[PDB]
Amino acid sequence: MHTAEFLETEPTEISSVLAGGYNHPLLRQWQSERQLTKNMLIFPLFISD
């Protein structure tokens, strides 16, 4: 009967390991080129006659 197959693999390469860079909630902020501040937003205003 169908049994789970598991191929054999070589040792892990360090170049394959990116995960240590995003594992904590904080690392998710750390990983952004720039964060959202309030002085970045521009609110459109429609002024009537």
Binding of residue 35 to its own copies (CB under 8 A) = yes
Binding of residue 37 to its own copies (CB under 8 A) = yes
CB of 29 to its own copies, least distance (A): 5
Binding of residue 23 to its own copies (CB under 8 A) = no
Element (H, E) at 28: helix 27-30
- In Å, the largest CA–CA distance within the chain is 79
CB of 30 to its own copies, least distance (A): 8
Site for its own copies (CB under 8 A): which residue of 6, 39, 41, 45? 39
Q: For Cα atoms 34, 32, 22, give the angle at the middle one, nearest 5 degrees.
A: 165
